[PDB]
Curated annotation (Swiss-Prot):
UniProt-listed InterPro entries: AB_hydrolase_1, AB_hydrolase_fold, Peptidase_S33, Pro_iminopeptidase
Organism: Serratia marcescens
Start and end residues of each AB hydrolase-1 domain: 38-293
Protein name: Proline iminopeptidase
Subunit structure: Monomer.
Matching NCBIfam families: pro_imino_pep_1
Tree of life domain: Bacteria
Catalysed reaction, written as an equation: Release of N-terminal proline from a peptide
Protein task: Specifically catalyzes the removal of N-terminal proline residues from peptides.
GO biological process: proteolysis
Keyword flag Transcription regulation: no
Annotated localization: Cytoplasm
Keyword terms of this UniProt record: Aminopeptidase, Cytoplasm, Hydrolase, Protease
GO cellular component: a single term: cytoplasm
């Protein structure tokens, strides 16, 4: 099984002012003359990791990685002002012009696959190839599955913790209930709910229990993670219709793509990947047996490495 390339530092980085109150952190890794690619992290509000650099051949790729508005090293931290899907799409174009890229490979998993699709369908001309993982298209059925009733049935003991702070009425609409707390004037109220929300996800993204999950409970990370995620879900991803990302697939069918999805992905059902593949025959679908959601699930990582390697010749 293929693994990550060796660790390496970015060769350049900085903050880009968007003009509307945001300074987004970005970095360039790999070969300044290599094949251009952009990495889109998940969440939303998840942030990039130095390990995301090791997903592309150091000798053949010129990788641009960045923290989306309000998370990671992008300022202001945990900000929900001017933080929507369409602003992020604009941010990607801004970063592309900065790095002087005319066209690049879009690598995105989870919410990153959601933004990757939104971006690609808005600027088809700027996308050379796509590598998608753990497909998430933001349909009501998807949000209901992970945050109302669905995954809850596979992790009943964990789901009870999420509901522990809600009254009987609030439990009717968990997303809405958490929205109130996450937007409370009381920082303590925000943090208590941010932690519960983030740990739920942290403990359900891998087939087997991981020690990595504990980091989802870290105060600063959790605060921005939960606030931003809940904000996007409260607004239905700022899409004009439930299946926007699926009905606009015709706009990108000519683009070479690889879809990798874990069979037992509990955050995003494999049905999403199947639905996408059905509308996108050209794409190559890889359903990884025995794997969960996370990009570093052995079998999922293996397919990701092979995909980027092949697209780089
Ligand atoms: C693996 C990665 C860090 C990209 C990740 N983990 N979870 C996500 C998400 O985008 C999930 C999907 C529903 C809500 N948050 O993305």
């Amino acid at each position: 099984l293929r693994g990550l390339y060796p660790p390496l530092a970015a060769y350049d980085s900085g903050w880009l002012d968007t003009g509307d109150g945001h300074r987004i952190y970005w970095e360039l890794s790999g070969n300044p003359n290599g094949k251009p690619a952009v990495f889109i992290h998940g969440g939303p509000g998840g942030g990039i990791s130095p390990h995301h650099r090791q997903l592309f051949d150091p000798e053949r790729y010129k990788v641009l990685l960045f923290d989306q508005r309000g998370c990671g090293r992008s300022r202001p931290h945990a900000s929900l002002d001017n933080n929507t899907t369409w602003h992020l799409v604009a941010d990607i174009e801004r970063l592309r012009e900065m790095a002087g890229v005319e066209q690049w490979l879009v690598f995105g998993g989870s919410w990153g696959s959601t933004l990757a699709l939104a971006y690609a369908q808005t600027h088809p001309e700027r996308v050379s190839e796509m590598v998608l993982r753990g497909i998430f298209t933001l349909r009501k059925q998807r949000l209901h599955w992970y945050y109302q009733d669905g995954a809850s049935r596979f992790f009943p003991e964990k789901w009870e913790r999420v509901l522990s702070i809600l009254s009987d009425d609030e439990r009717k609409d968990v997303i809405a209930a958490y929205r109130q707390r996450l937007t409370s004037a009381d920082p303590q109220v925000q943090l208590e709910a941010a932690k519960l929300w983030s740990v739920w996800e942290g403990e359900t993204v891998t087939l087997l229990p991981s020690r990595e999950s504990a980091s989802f409970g870290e105060d600063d990370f959790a605060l921005a993670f939960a606030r931003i995620e809940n904000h996007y879900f409260t607004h239905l991803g700022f899409l004009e219709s439930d299946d926007q990302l699926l009905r606009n697939v015709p706009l990108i069918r000519h683009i070479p793509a690889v879809i990798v999805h874990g069979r037992y992905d509990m955050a995003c059902q494999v049905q999403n990947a199947w639905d996408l593949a059905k509308a996108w025959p050209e794409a190559e679908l890889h359903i990884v047996e025995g794997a969960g959601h996370s990009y570093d699930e052995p079998g999922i990582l293996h397919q990701l490495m092979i995909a980027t390697d092949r697209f780089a010749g």
